[PDB]
Design a protein around this ligand. Sequence first.
Ligand SMILES: Nc1ncnc2c1ncn2[C@@H]1O[C@H](COP(=O)(O)OP(=O)(O)O)[C@@H](O)[C@H]1O
Ligand SMILES: Nc1ncnc2c1ncn2[C@@H]1O[C@H](COP(=O)(O)OP(=O)(O)O)[C@@H](O)[C@H]1O
Ligand SMILES: Nc1ncnc2c1ncn2[C@@H]1O[C@H](COP(=O)(O)OP(=O)(O)O)[C@@H](O)[C@H]1O
Ligand SMILES: [Mg+2]
Ligand SMILES: [Mg+2]
Ligand SMILES: [Mg+2]
Lengths: 52, 528, 532, 535
Amino acid sequence: LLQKGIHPTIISESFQKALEKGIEILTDMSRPVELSDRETLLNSATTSLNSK
Amino acid sequence: MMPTPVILLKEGTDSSQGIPQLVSNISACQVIAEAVRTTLGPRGMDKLIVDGRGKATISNDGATILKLLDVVHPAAKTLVDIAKSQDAEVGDGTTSVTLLAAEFLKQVKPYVEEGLHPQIIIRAFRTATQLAVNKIKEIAVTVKKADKVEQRKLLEKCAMTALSSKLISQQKAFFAKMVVDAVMMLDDLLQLKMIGIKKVQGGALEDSQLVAGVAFKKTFSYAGFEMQPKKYHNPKIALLNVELELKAEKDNAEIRVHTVEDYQAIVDAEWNILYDKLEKIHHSGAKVVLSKLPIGDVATQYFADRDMFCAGRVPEEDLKRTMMACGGSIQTSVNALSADVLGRCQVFEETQIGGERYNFFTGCPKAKTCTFILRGGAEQFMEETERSLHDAIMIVRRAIKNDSVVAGGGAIEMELSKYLRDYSRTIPGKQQLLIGAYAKALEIIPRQLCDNAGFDATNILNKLRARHAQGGTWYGVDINNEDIADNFEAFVWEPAMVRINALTAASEAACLIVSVDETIKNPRSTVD
Amino acid sequence: PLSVFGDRSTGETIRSQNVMAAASIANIVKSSLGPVGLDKMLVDDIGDVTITNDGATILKLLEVEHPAAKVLCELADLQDKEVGDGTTSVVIIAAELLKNADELVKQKIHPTSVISGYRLACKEAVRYINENLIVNTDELGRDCLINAAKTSMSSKIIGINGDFFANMVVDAVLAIKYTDIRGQPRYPVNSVNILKAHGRSQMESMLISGYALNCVVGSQGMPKRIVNAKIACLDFSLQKTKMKLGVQVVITDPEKLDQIRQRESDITKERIQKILATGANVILTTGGIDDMCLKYFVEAGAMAVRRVLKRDLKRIAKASGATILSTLANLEGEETFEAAMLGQAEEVVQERICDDELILIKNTKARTSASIILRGANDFMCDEMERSLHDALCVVKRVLESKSVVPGGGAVEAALSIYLENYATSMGSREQLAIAEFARSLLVIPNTLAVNAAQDSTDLVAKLRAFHNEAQVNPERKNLKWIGLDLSNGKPRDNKQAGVFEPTIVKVKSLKFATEAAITILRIDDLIKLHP
Amino acid sequence: ASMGTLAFDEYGRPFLIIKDQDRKSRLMGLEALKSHIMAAKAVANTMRTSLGPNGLDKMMVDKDGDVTVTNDGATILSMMDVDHQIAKLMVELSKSQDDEIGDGTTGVVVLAGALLEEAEQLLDRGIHPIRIADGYEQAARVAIEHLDKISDSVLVDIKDTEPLIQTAKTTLGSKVVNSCHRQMAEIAVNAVLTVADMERRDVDFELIKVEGKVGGRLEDTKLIKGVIVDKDFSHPQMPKKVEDAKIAILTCPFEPPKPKTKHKLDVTSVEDYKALQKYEKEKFEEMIQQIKETGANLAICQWGFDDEANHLLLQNNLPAVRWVGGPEIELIAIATGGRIVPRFSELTAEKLGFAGLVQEISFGTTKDKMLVIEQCKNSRAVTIFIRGGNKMIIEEAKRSLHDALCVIRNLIRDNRVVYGGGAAEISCALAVSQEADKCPTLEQYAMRAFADALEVIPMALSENSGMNPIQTMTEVRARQVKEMNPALGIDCLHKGTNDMKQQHVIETLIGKKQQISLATQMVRMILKIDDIRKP
Ligand SMILES: Nc1ncnc2c1ncn2[C@@H]1O[C@H](COP(=O)(O)OP(=O)(O)O)[C@@H](O)[C@H]1O
Ligand SMILES: Nc1ncnc2c1ncn2[C@@H]1O[C@H](COP(=O)(O)OP(=O)(O)O)[C@@H](O)[C@H]1O
Ligand SMILES: Nc1ncnc2c1ncn2[C@@H]1O[C@H](COP(=O)(O)OP(=O)(O)O)[C@@H](O)[C@H]1O
Ligand SMILES: [Mg+2]
Ligand SMILES: [Mg+2]
Ligand SMILES: [Mg+2]
């Protein structure tokens, strides 16, 4: 982007805008979870431990 | 160990013996194979090696890489030696020999570690090698038709297969057609020195040309050379080995005169000798004069005045190629310049090729020689192009000797592995394990092709094994489709002698490495 | 680009380096496996000499730099700590597992698949061992313990004298048997004091029916032998009394100084008078005793020993029924010693052992104790004797605690190899290869055993595998599971009948530890070595 | 990640395979390719500032302290003291481009750097470098075919030299001689068109003698239809100007003859001495008379002469110049239409050359004299005499004129041209992108990376000119797509139009094809290296 001739302030503001849009997208992809749902907690723990 | 006041051998003598030293030898061979492992197949890569002086060599050829490595391990030097032997006898497959030898040693390493006698391993290797060579000779495909078109197609396919691993693989069809055209013009001995190879910087690979004649670079023209015409439409060529300039008649000659008239006569006699040689050359009818010895400025101006071309200090190989292309004879004396000793060509011309002048002899109908003019962007680019063309030329020469082919891409080796496994299933059992290990080691080349191409080698090897078990001799690795295919119908063809020599050399190297049980290194003398 | 002050190795380079380090560590000790193995003699930089056959001792004395090699050495140490035997076998198995796993990885098999296959193979091997290859010791009697001790002491300096040493070990272990809560018998090995003294041959080593002290009487005037000993064990010194840091003596009237100085020793005199008045004959203390108290004991005609080790004193006190006293203070604020605090023994003797003397407390009551005095040609041989004796004691303890044993001589390894090679075909596609490699790597033990004897390893291993395959396939040939290796004659042999036994815990723990170490090393594919 | 491998055996025994293996480094796999791409990118980014009319120069100092100020990319890379092997590869790429074409030695390096930069991000996504090279080759073939399609043919007739002058001006625009731009282009075009074989044959560059002398002004540079010589008349009292000179070109020193063979002449009496003295005097007189008999006005020798011959030449009204170099002798003979004579006895009137004016030229307060031979009848050799205020600008003018001569030589070789200013690059990138939309998906990434690397030239041109690179390049590309006009490029000089055809920004088609081909092949060669084994 810098080699193309863009100042590193338009890049920063554009990255901030993209981050806000991405936060919106990720929140849209979310799914409510209840702490009483043990299966979801077990799945999350297994996913965390899968790479170790 | 005890001090032993007077020692047996001199100090610094290192001795290694037993199973550990042979395991170390196998490991060193593995290292040497890994040094050239990645340069195999159409998806192979190149290695860059910098010498002490700072010059770098970039190559895909296994023999060149192994030679450039300063290998000092006594057991590891055998792989370099067999690579050189394969390059000398065949010219192609210098990577496969090292891969196969190291794979044999790696496969028999576990039996070495458990105390198996090396003689049993050597006998099993010899038996397996004999069986594999006989199988290759039996199943190799040959055509008993002597058809010119079919022979040309076979040579071109073999050349493309030999070329489809180098940086010139994109123009492999074009370069293979050039190579087959060049080799087919050699008469009966297929001498390599009859195929000149000139590398000129600049130009694309497709700009390289094959001259149906002889071409060589301009050789230090004198004054008055630019006054000579640079194109002739039916020149007679005088091939000479004569120094055409004013000089002492002999090194030991001495002239003694006591009269000014005799002094003038001697000067005029020297001039008359030179002019007599020049007039004898001119009266022969020749328009182009080439000499292995220097041609002076006086002779150059004399030829310019007669509208004739001269070129002195021509390299001997270029003169020999010119003689073979034109049909004359290199004359050390100009006293008998008959028409039988003068070369003929349809067109002679001096042209510009990338900031360098070259002399062209084209239109020769009876030429027995060629000249490649390779174009590239760098010195190592053209050097590697020359190496690839040399591989292709050697392959085409061997195929000219005999048109026996086997499908490449590991198909022949998978068939050999299946045959050897089937044979090993029907023997007592001490040799059965070793012959099975030999058959398994035969699978390294297709596995290495898959690894270099970035596939999953295990699944491809399983599919190849299943296909070979159920029938189909020529199923190998399809690099483009990431699968298996009938490599004979895909024209991945190799001369049978390539694999025969590869197996023979790899087996001999493995047997020699296994047969050694002790290594002794005497202390260095004259370290300076 | 990284700009890290150090060296970085990534991928095949570091994997091969780790495998090379593990293989070197294995090859160091591979020559010391099985009854035909031979000892190694290690020399320190200061000239100290250690002659040993134990893998743990060799790997502890060695100075190691590579992290994977350190992992293997700590694996050997852990196997020694948790089992006591099979220290060489676990290292060899772990290195072979790592080598075969790396060979699989070089074939573009993902390391996670290899790890999963190794875990499955280890679990199935443990299950198969527990369900098929274990032998209950209830039907074998005392001969099972003797056979286990003989098998353990093979390859050791005391192997040929095993007929004697196995009886000694079994008696020593049985002498310290006790049952804790839940009614489970326990065998606290390391409670058998082992004393090493060069001198007479191995066959004249003594098993003491009591305890042996590496101590002598405080004064030459004391008797060297007491018949009916009343042992008093003290945890305090018997010296002239000195006030603490917080107490100071300041004299203003000179007439009090002599009384102060007299009481300064009269306190200890009174304490010793009480201790002797209770009727004690032998007094053992962890603290020192000065000349005055020694003379009190001499006049009393009693044996007094000073600077007794705390563990030795605890063992003696509990074997004889005495109570350790760190002070003569009761719950009434007074200074009393009671006869109920006295231990009893049938004899206490200071005997001479090779121009030196030690104290033997013979036949302690209310509890049986055991001590072993090893006689050898020199110090190094006695040290190797002690190491081998400890190995045998640990093996017997494991056999007595868990009453299952497995045949030795590589029978378990061959059976597991055959079973796992058969079983791999029913699990996955690449974990199949991992389980097959696990089974193949399990054969390194019989191969090394045969190699050490200069026998035909290939043919013997092939015969063993054929026997075990026949046992597993044929349903009425289940008696062939005990076919092991007879290294003396180089032939297969029914090791269950021959008496070559091992505790099941040795094999199970070795398998689990080797698998975990191999997985840990295989988990590495990149090394950053920061510059110091 | 270096030093190779070290195991020292799994038994503790020494493990030595390669001599001095502990002092030899080794790079493998993707890391070596990343390092090579980084080095090539550094070289290309260094060179990309010297592109276009607004490009800047590099002041280069050799090991001896001599200063060279230049814009030629080949010269910069050749004089640059590199140690990296990939940098040497880029230097050789520039040298090969200079050899084959003579112009565009900077575009090839920038193009190769851009190609490798795109290949870096392609490799990061898990593509085999051979696949990237194959896609680059496919896109290069497409671009070369498109260049052939969009080329235009110019007339290379001597009667009308306007397209040739425009092409030479485009070549010289980026050089320091843009002050004398049109004059330099005209003299280069005329020089090439003079020494040329008309039937589309070669142009012999050693028939052009490019020589420069300090002093004067850069505008004083002129094309002489003859030969300029660094010598002067042998006698100080000889006339300094000869008109309608009939030149006798000789390669024999004006000295008594001597055989080449070892010879001894014996003097045995006074009569012998007198005869020898008379013989020497008569030889001098005879050679002077033989030269004079042909009617020649000027004598040119190669090996100098002695005092008696010099005074006889002055006394007989024969201006002469001695110690003229061999190449200068050949050039004088070619220009004046005379033969080179090896001895006086062979001299004839028909072997005499002709020159309308032979003059000795002074250069201010410098004491140095040079000889000018011009006004020849049908001279087939030319010399370019360059003046300037310092030797650095003279060397740079020599390089610039060589570039212009090479460009006109290429035009002689092939008379097809394309319009520069990045217009050809933009059109080729558009063609490659359009072709990528049809091929299977796997090579699409390589073809699009090739298009992006092609688009670096207009971006570099716009950046050097101060305008925004991406915006200008996008606008020009959109205009090219909308209205079918492959001549729209970067308006580097701010002339108010983007049409390079109107601006006469013309460059040879063969040069662009060579640029693309060389860059693609060298990028393929670099991409195939995966191991380095420096000592
Ligand atoms: N088009 C192709 N498809 C599949 N395999 C090929 C093809 N061309 C060559 N090979 C295989 O690549 C292997 C190595 O060939 P190459 O690298 O050219 O020379 P070397 O044998 O010296 O390594 C050969 O065994 C051949 O079978
Ligand atoms: N009498 C015997 N006959 C055959 N094999 C034996 C005998 N005694 C021990 N072995 C085998 O030798 C192997 C090696 O034991 P050893 O190395 O001495 O123990 P450790 O592994 O604790 O050092 C054991 O696995 C055991 O099965
Ligand atoms: N007057 C001009 N207007 C726009 N672009 C130009 C002009 N003159 C030259 N260029 C461009 O500048 C680029 C670089 O040319 P130059 O620096 O002269 O030689 P090289 O190609 O060796 O860098 C060429 O591709 C050409 O298209
Ligand atoms: Mg080949
Ligand atoms: Mg043991
Ligand atoms: Mg230019």
